[PDB]
C-alpha cells in the first residue's frame, strides 16, 4: 500500500522535508518538500519514505545520519513504524535496531546512535495536507 502525507515533528513543530540529499524538519504545512509518499509492506511493519518533489528516499546511513538518496533499494532506507502508547508515531531503522528518525527543536536531524524511543525528538504525528 502507498499513501501520501506529512510528518509533524513533536519537538520541531514543523514537518519533515526531503530537500534532496539534505533532510530537515522545518516544513510549513503544505511545503512541497514535506509531501511524503510512504510505502507500507503487506505485513504493516515496515515503510519506505520518499519525498514526492525530489523523489529521494529518506535513509539512515552507518553513521546514523539521516540523508536523502535517489536509490531506495538499501535496507538503510526502510523503517519500522511504531504507534506508541502516547499516540505519536516513531520510525526505527530497520537496518540499525534501536536507532530512530528524530529532530531537534530547530528541525535539525539527529544521529541514530544518540536516539531512543522515549525521546520526544523521535515522535511524530501524521498529517493529510
Swiss-Prot record:
Entry-listed glycosylation sites: 87
Similarity comment: family membership: Belongs to the heparin-binding growth factors family.
Annotated organism of origin: Homo sapiens (Human)
GO biological process: one example: positive regulation of ERK1 and ERK2 cascade
Subunit structure: Interacts with FGFR3 and FGFR4.
This protein's GO CC annotations: cytoplasm; extracellular region; extracellular space; nucleolus
Protein name: Fibroblast growth factor 18
Subcellular location: Secreted
GO molecular function, one term: type 2 fibroblast growth factor receptor binding
Function summary: Plays an important role in the regulation of cell proliferation, cell differentiation and cell migration. Required for normal ossification and bone development. Stimulates hepatic and intestinal proliferation.
Amino acid at each position: 500500500q502507498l499513501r501520501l502525507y506529512q510528518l509533524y515533528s513533536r519537538t520541531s513543530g514543523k514537518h519533515i522535508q526531503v530537500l534532496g540529499r539534505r533532510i530537515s524538519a522545518r516544513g510549513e504545512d503544505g511545503d512541497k518538500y514535506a509531501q511524503l509518499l510512504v510505502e507500507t509492506d503487506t505485513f504493516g511493519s515496515q515503510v519506505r519514505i520518499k519525498g514526492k518533489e525530489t523523489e529521494f528516499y529518506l535513509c539512515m546511513n552507518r553513521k546514523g545520519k539521516l540523508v536523502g538518496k535517489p536509490d531506495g533499494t538499501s535496507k538503510e532506507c526502510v523503517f519500522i513504524e511504531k504507534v506508541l502508547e502516547n499516540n505519536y508515531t516513531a520510525l526505527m531503522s530497520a537496518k540499525y535496531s534501536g536507532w530512530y528518525v528524530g529532530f531537534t527543536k530547530k528541525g535539525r536531524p539527529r544521529k541514530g546512535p544518540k536516539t531512543r524511543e522515549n525521546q520526544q525528538d523521535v515522535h511524530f504525528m501524521k498529517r493529510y495536507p
